[PDB]
Design a protein around this ligand. Structure first.
Ligand SMILES: Cc1cc2nc3c(=O)[nH]c(=O)nc-3n(C[C@H](O)[C@H](O)[C@H](O)COP(=O)(O)OP(=O)(O)OC[C@H]3O[C@@H](n4cnc5c(N)ncnc54)[C@H](O)[C@@H]3O)c2cc1C
Ligand SMILES: Cc1cc2nc3c(=O)[nH]c(=O)nc-3n(C[C@H](O)[C@H](O)[C@H](O)COP(=O)(O)OP(=O)(O)OC[C@H]3O[C@@H](n4cnc5c(N)ncnc54)[C@H](O)[C@@H]3O)c2cc1C
Lengths: 267, 284
């Protein structure tokens, strides 16, 4: 396999979503992802739920599972205790984040590397983090995280492919040598995606807004239309040298599974 | 540079909204189950206000009763121009004229003139229909050349012959190699055929069945397509997404080339064709 993939899941908050997640884990695990990750939500499950899912994935599939760890409302001593626990129990890859609120993500990267030789992934923003002083400052921050020890950068989702491409070029110009892995968000629920995008400054091309117009009560068409968009995107990215994709599955597997299939990533 | 072109294609497609005509082809159901499925599809697709819809007729089946009834049932249920397919198999000239005149006197003014897969040619059928009355006549076109045809050129002159006889528009056999259809369209105008070569689109959800249809109609399945469906025999969900993707990409390219008319072989299913139409701006 020339292309590597990873899948992102979130801690289920209901019995129904819990069932869906494990079904998705089994489906996607067959594609042998390089790793999978589980997000964290301070008021939507906490660290224990994130850790529980991580442990469950590891026990059930043997896959490398990376918890997303944030450093807000958490003290350095707490983070070191947590990191040590994770390492001693087989968790060797962490997605180091600041989280939405003193410490910035680069501070956490440093703290983690002091504890152990963790594989570390950090967030990158092709369209600039909402709170950044400027695009230049945000790029310098990414370089700071990479220089602190980050092994790879995973981007916020995007729908304007050129935005990702230009960003990758600026990263290279800035001397950031790790892979800038595009985070792909397959869209089946446009209203939810639009809310996500508006809150993260991610641009939704006019042709895309037009493409989902009128489908609020048509889930089947939304899925076909969304899969087409995602398949076209990864095709172009692949043609531009991208060999790694991180999928925001939202705990569902059909779309990401099919997209991987078109990339030659099969069981 | 690859990214820019994509955004351009997608935007031009978004701007086509409200300028593309579409037609849907259906076949007579053989079970109570397919009967319900058909009418559910008709109700759903009718909301897209197609230029017209058509119903196939099994050549040498004698079930011409089912086809005609469905046609009337569609016209009386939706009010859409329902065009029945007519063949030259198991029918005499005097017999055909009877059907033609029977249709015209029942509201049916559009007919798809076909010879029919053998168990008197289409051109002879159009000429015959023309004299009986002034129906709109749609004939079959083959981008990859009809199996029986002795040559590509001979097959082409035949279509012209059918057009010259009074055929309004030609509808192509489904195809998956866009470049083949484009080369054929160029040959059609270069050969003096003045009607549009309407692409017949076959959205694929069942590759096995499609591969079969292709081996019976002499339609080529590109290597990239076989590769795209490889390993999905027991994955209907993935096949549908992959098939919808291929179909959406095809019409997007065709639309940019100037095609404003599409004919969908629905196989009595609405989901895929409905979605493909959506991307073309054809919506309720
Ligand atoms: C792949 C990915 C996964 C994510 N997973 C989660 C998750 O599970 N849970 C969750 O809560 N959030 C998650 N997030 C969201 C993330 O936590 C927010 O975007 C958060 O606001 C910033 O986190 P960060 O790690 O990018 O922080 P940082 O890299 O620290 O950046 C945050 C802001 O601070 C700025 N900055 C950095 N250093 C300085 C400085 N010295 N002075 C001033 N400004 C500075 C940056 O330019 C930027 O504007 C994820 C994001 C991505 C792209
Ligand atoms: C849109 C579409 C809808 C269809 N619907 C149906 C349907 O409802 N029912 C059904 O039974 N079938 C249907 N068919 C299939 C069709 O009937 C078969 O392909 C059949 O073989 C006859 O094709 P035709 O109408 O193109 O006949 P023709 O146009 O007569 O051509 C058929 C062959 O005869 C050759 N030819 C023509 N005239 C001569 C001549 N004078 N000398 C030598 N060679 C000649 C041509 O080159 C060609 O190979 C459909 C096909 C399409 C593309």
């Amino acid at each position: 396999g020339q292309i590597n993939v990873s899948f992102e899941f979130f801690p289920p908050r209901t019995s129904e979503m819990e069932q869906t997640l494990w079904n998705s884990i089994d489906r996607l695990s067959s594609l042998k992802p390089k790793f999978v990750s589980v997000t964290y939500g301070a008021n939507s499950g906490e660290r224990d739920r994130t850790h529980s899912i991580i442990k469950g994935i590891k026990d059930r599939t043997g896959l490398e599972a990376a918890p997303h760890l944030t450093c807000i409302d958490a003290t350095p001593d707490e983070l070191r205790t947590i990191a040590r626990d994770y390492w001693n129990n087989g968790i060797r890859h962490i997605v180091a984040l600041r989280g939405d609120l003193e410490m910035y993500a680069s501070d956490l990267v440093t703290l983690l590397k002091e504890v152990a030789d963790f594989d570390i992934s950090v967030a990158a923003y092709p369209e600039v983090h909402p709170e950044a002083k400027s695009a230049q400052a945000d790029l310098l921050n990414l370089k700071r995280k990479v220089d602190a020890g980050a092994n790879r950068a995973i981007t916020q989702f995007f729908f304007d492919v050129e935005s990702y491409l230009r960003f990758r070029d600026r990263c290279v110009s800035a001397g950031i040598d790790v892979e800038i892995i595009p985070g792909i968000l397959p869209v089946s629920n446009f209203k939810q995606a639009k809310k996500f995008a508006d809150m993260t400054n991610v641009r939704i091309p006019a042709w895309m807004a037009q493409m989902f117009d009128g489908l609020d009560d048509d889930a089947e068409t939304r899925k076909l239309v969304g899969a087409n968009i995602a398949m076209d995107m990864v095709k172009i990215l692949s043609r531009e040298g991208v060999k790694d994709f991180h999928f925001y599955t939202l705990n569902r597997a059909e779309m990401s599974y099919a997209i991987c299939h078109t990339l030659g990533v099969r069981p």
